[PDB]
Write an enzyme that holds these catalytic residues in place. Sequence first.
Site, mmCIF file in Angstrom:
data_model
loop_
_atom_site.group_PDB
_atom_site.id
_atom_site.type_symbol
_atom_site.label_atom_id
_atom_site.label_comp_id
_atom_site.label_asym_id
_atom_site.label_seq_id
_atom_site.Cartn_x
_atom_site.Cartn_y
_atom_site.Cartn_z
ATOM 1 N N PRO A 1 4.156 6.150 2.226
ATOM 2 C CA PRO A 1 3.512 6.077 3.733
ATOM 3 C C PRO A 1 2.317 7.275 3.738
ATOM 4 O O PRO A 1 2.337 8.366 3.460
ATOM 5 C CB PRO A 1 4.672 6.430 4.443
ATOM 6 C CG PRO A 1 5.467 7.312 3.758
ATOM 7 C CD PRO A 1 5.458 6.711 2.311
ATOM 8 N N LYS A 32 10.637 7.168 -0.045
ATOM 9 C CA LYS A 32 9.753 7.371 -0.917
ATOM 10 C C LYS A 32 9.765 8.661 -1.281
ATOM 11 O O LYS A 32 9.856 9.557 -0.604
ATOM 12 C CB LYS A 32 8.439 6.777 -0.598
ATOM 13 C CG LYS A 32 8.446 5.530 0.252
ATOM 14 C CD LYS A 32 7.867 4.440 -0.443
ATOM 15 C CE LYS A 32 7.916 2.942 0.131
ATOM 16 N NZ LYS A 32 9.250 2.316 -0.145
ATOM 17 N N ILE A 64 2.922 0.388 2.366
ATOM 18 C CA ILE A 64 3.350 -1.123 1.652
ATOM 19 C C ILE A 64 4.495 -1.515 1.783
ATOM 20 O O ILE A 64 5.647 -0.926 1.207
ATOM 21 C CB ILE A 64 2.782 -0.992 0.390
ATOM 22 C CG1 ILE A 64 1.324 -0.409 0.254
ATOM 23 C CG2 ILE A 64 2.772 -2.175 -0.561
ATOM 24 C CD1 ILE A 64 0.910 0.060 -1.254
HETATM 25 C C1 LIG Z 1 3.421 5.780 1.237
HETATM 26 S S1 LIG Z 1 4.260 5.611 -0.220
HETATM 27 N N1 LIG Z 1 2.160 5.216 1.453
HETATM 28 C C2 LIG Z 1 1.298 4.721 0.261
HETATM 29 C C3 LIG Z 1 0.412 3.871 1.090
HETATM 30 C C4 LIG Z 1 0.678 2.939 1.810
HETATM 31 C C5 LIG Z 1 -0.234 2.118 2.729
HETATM 32 C C6 LIG Z 1 -1.478 2.770 2.829
HETATM 33 C C7 LIG Z 1 -1.962 3.774 2.119
HETATM 34 C C8 LIG Z 1 -1.048 4.586 1.477
#
Ligand SMILES: *C(=S)NCc1ccccc1
Lengths: 114, 114, 114
Positions: A1, A32, A64
């Site tokens: 995130p 995560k 995601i």
């Molecule tokens: C958390 S692992 N975010 C990675 C991510 C997800 C969506 C957009 C950008 C970055």
Amino acid sequence: PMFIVNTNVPRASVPDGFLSELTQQLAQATGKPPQYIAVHVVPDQLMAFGGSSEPCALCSLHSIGKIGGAQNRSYSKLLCGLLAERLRISPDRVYINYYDMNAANVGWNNSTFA
Amino acid sequence: PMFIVNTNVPRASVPDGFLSELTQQLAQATGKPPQYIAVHVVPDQLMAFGGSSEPCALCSLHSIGKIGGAQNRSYSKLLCGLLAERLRISPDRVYINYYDMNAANVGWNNSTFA
Amino acid sequence: PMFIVNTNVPRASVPDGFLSELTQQLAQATGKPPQYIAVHVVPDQLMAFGGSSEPCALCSLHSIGKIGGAQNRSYSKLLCGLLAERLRISPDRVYINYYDMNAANVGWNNSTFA
Ligand SMILES: *C(=S)NCc1ccccc1
Ligand SMILES: *C(=S)NCc1ccccc1
Ligand SMILES: *C(=S)NCc1ccccc1
């Protein structure tokens, strides 16, 4: 995130350690590892909520997957609580936009996550 | 609705009652009570429109429903108007991204609007 | 294309001509007329990536179509390369959110693109 806070609260009222705490709390909350997590705080904004220049925050959380009804309620409790505890922002003056991104629509390290 | 303006227009060039006018004009526009309307203006930005550094704006309007072809046309006329008149940015140098948010994807007050 | 980069890199480290280079390079990469390309850089941000305050960037690229699997990998490589060259940001400390906007949802010149 990745999580972005824009607030009218002054820089000086953002307590030391607040980015690490965001990073840590979001890791736990989403499941995560902290190495994936981005956090971004923007104080001293010219903003209003309900016509009021009382403290407020406009936020977004991109992920995601791991986006949905219960999950987003759980994030909002968590993030609002943090914003209330650390920045003294009332939760009813907080908006958080949640984004379920497709892996192919998120860039990282010269490519995407697809 | 929540509405964000990012712009290269100087801060002292943003009129004192601009946030409120945004708040009020949007509440009338969308039929939403003002108490729900959040507004956000970000001046002195390093940005360019068409390779040019003359005044411009990158904007967004998030709303739960009330998004679509005619309404968005109407919002743009309204919002370009206000940016034209108050910030003296030409309408052909303004982008406005509209977002139709699901209530379950907007956090507020330790939960969501779901 | 409109492209926004937020970064903890100090303003003085953003080299002269960088917005023009982004316009130019985005124009090259999307083949889209540069007169409609918007770029936006926001330095000195308070942000962390993987818990670390080393240089990082959070970005977005909005477009009406021409968003897809290979294209986005191509944008990431283009854009991460620029940020590595121009701002000395490692590509593995860069997130770029890609958005395929509907024309009815993009406001410009008192209207939308529908
Ligand atoms: C958390 S692992 N975010 C990675 C991510 C997800 C969506 C957009 C950008 C970055
Ligand atoms: C107008 S009532 N906006 C409420 C809202 C909608 C979408 C995202 C945040 C806030
Ligand atoms: C490149 S030609 N961008 C135009 C655009 C697309 C989507 C949202 C804002 C601007």
